[PDB]
Ligand binder design. Structure first.
Ligand SMILES: CC(C)=CC[C@@H](O)C1=CC(=O)c2c(O)ccc(O)c2C1=O
Ligand SMILES: CC(C)=CC[C@@H](O)C1=CC(=O)c2c(O)ccc(O)c2C1=O
Ligand SMILES: [Co+2]
Ligand SMILES: [Co+2]
Lengths: 380, 380
């Protein structure tokens, strides 16, 4: 049941902004590890005396990495005279954000038809304002509201290249890395209480609940066409194994973004490329499910995947689950930084062709059962 | 003239510790970019609730990358009950250090015969104490005094693997990267006034001035055998081109470590390996000197280098200068992080065989002249 209750025209995921201690080093690590190209910069060399911001792109996926310079560099400036290309930036907020959470996502950015109206409607509908709409060079408008914890949902809209004040990067500094990742599929938040979080965000967006088929309860909010997907988790206390959501909240000092799901146009090549680089600067992956998990795969998705594609799944450690609508291939990295907080998920969806509809195959919740009922190989 | 006036037995450079926002991401970047192996860890997985510390090694070169966790994780601990493996660590100092300077070197560590006595003698001789001697597990003793700005000179001594509480890293997480770098040759500080800095450090170490053959004045302090080498620079104001030392001091918020000189056992393979990786996560190098600089190289070092080695120097952008004692091959990276502050120098020394004596060939001061008198190619 899709009631199509968006309160403003929401287009697509536009970018994800990390707040870092040092943007250069995180961005270069992510570039190698994920296969993303250096696309745009705003820093000292572009006149920005306030922050360093570097953009990586892969297909439609945009990762923005931002860190503050010394406040002294911009001591004479005021907000009207700022050289920051992202006027919502604030040294005190960024240092407090990073000191409090460590490396993680500050902004989940979505493109809307009119950022000023989306901000006005949102706040009128319960959104906590974070940064009011600002018009960059008569061309781009950006506005921010609180999402959960210190994460903001950022609205961007264009009259008609990333943002004004960013420069395209000279191509000799821009090596065309690509491991197949093409767009952001969904972005997941962890909160201490799901209900009030759901009520708040659904409240000011009009996003509807997306239908689903140990440790947490979750739910998914979605825009009209279900291209913007925002799952949210809460912990379930009192279990046998401690909730990883609870571990997240402890180490992150509260609510925040748990993981980013990146859609690959060929998940097998992406995982081959990423695994080759795990131990030489890239990302590590969670431990692989046992071979019994893969001995049981022929029976539920042998429909969709050949024996060859199934055996390739076992090599790369890929997990597979299925909706009534499509099939989902997924895998999870280990945490991206020091803290056991943010990680990345690689995914590819098969089915639901109309273009492909969002959430096709769901989010893998069928894999808790498939996984637990596979650790019965410890008796095999 | 070497008066051999060390006030305590100084052995060798032991390690360099960076204070980071996120140790994981800086360490993985440095590992790929420089060819260093993941060797030791102290973090949550080893019981350290206070900081994450990762060690990279290449030959004798040890780079330590440290970042604080949330203070909350260790709120119940006191210094006697600390889980930090480096008891000099302090959340407030590290966050203040990093917020103030950004990514850079916190500790220049040298191995001494007795860290407690070296600390006592130092302070008795004018050193500002930073962290008093602590004995780690009846085996290792560590003590810290102020060097310049917020950089500490760290004394370590062993009764008889890096430090207690560090774990060796499982070899599947430890890929044997190596591009030829073998040890730290010297570590360079920038200060607003050279004289008082020189007086202070020579004061409590007994290190002597090392004899030399636009923008700055400098001098070099050295231990008895001249294996520990500590150049220090100050700016010269009023020039035509602004002092880069002054630019350093502005962006670093004051004095600090300018660059690390890493000795390669084969600088041509190191630079080939590093340049291949510049645009895919590694380090960038300063612009190459003009071909006229290389057309003039046959006349001064054609003695030491073949036409082939000279043409290889032009390919890799290597600079070459010469003492009366030896020949020095060097090159400089661009800044390692967001700020135009810390960078790295790659070097290899030829000559002064006795083992090779320290500073053989000097530090390249002859290249200001060779470089300026080469930009007369803009008229060629
Ligand atoms: C293996 C790991 C570090 C975390 C997995 C787990 O926390 C998780 C990931 C996820 O992606 C997801 C959804 O996408 C949707 C519902 C839902 O319960 C979940 C999840 O539980
Ligand atoms: C190209 C660049 C970013 C910086 C070069 C310059 O700042 C420099 C480097 C250096 O290594 C050095 C010595 O090793 C010794 C004396 C001395 O004056 C110097 C230097 O001036
Ligand atoms: Co997911
Ligand atoms: Co040098």
């Amino acid at each position: 049941k899709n009631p199509k209750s968006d309160k403003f025209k929401v287009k697509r995921f536009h970018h994800i902004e990390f707040w870092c201690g040092d943007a250069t080093n995180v961005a270069r690590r992510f570039s190698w590890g994920l296969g993303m190209r250096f696309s745009a910069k705003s820093d000292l060399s572009t006149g920005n005396m306030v922050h360093a911001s570097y953009l990586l792109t892969s297909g439609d996926l945009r990762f923005l990495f931002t860190a503050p310079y010394s406040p002294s560099l911009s001591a004479g400036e005021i907000k009207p005279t700022t050289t920051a290309s992202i006027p919502s930036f604030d040294h005190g907020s960024c240092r407090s954000f990073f000191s409090s959470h460590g490396l993680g996502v500050r902004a989940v950015a979505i493109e809307v038809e009119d950022a000023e109206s989306a901000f006005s409607i949102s706040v009128a509908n319960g959104a906590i304002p974070s940064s009011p709409p600002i018009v960059l060079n008569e061309a781009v408008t950006i506005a921010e509201v609180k999402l959960y914890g210190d994460v903001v949902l950022r609205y961007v809209s264009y009259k008609a290249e990333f943002l004004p004040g960013f420069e395209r990067v000279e191509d000799a500094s821009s090596f065309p890395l690509d491991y197949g990742i093409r767009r952001l599929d969904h972005a997941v938040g962890n909160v201490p209480e799901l209900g009030p979080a759901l009520t708040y965000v659904a409240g000011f967006t009009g996003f509807h609940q997306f239908a689903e088929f140990s440790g947490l309860n979750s739910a998914v909010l979605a825009s009209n066409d279900e291209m913007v997907l925002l799952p949210i988790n809460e912990p379930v206390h009192g279990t046998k194994r401690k909730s990883q959501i609870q571990t997240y909240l402890e180490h992150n000092e509260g609510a925040g973004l748990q993981h980013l799901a990146l859609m690959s146009e060929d998940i097998f090549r992406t995982l081959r490329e990423m695994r080759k680089r795990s131990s030489i600067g890239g990302f590590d992956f969670m431990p692989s499910p046992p071979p019994t998990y893969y001995q049981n795969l022929k029976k539920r998705v042998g429909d969709v995947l050949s024996d060859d594609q199934i055996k390739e799944c076992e090599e790369l450690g890929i997990l597979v689950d299925r909706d009534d609508q499509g099939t989902l291939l997924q895998i999870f990295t280990k945490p991206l930084g020091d803290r056991p907080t943010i990680f990345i998920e690689i995914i590819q969806r098969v089915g639901c062709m109309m273009y492909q509809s969002g959430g096709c195959g769901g989010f893998g919740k069928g894999n808790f059962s498939e996984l637990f009922k596979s650790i019965e190989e410890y008796e095999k």
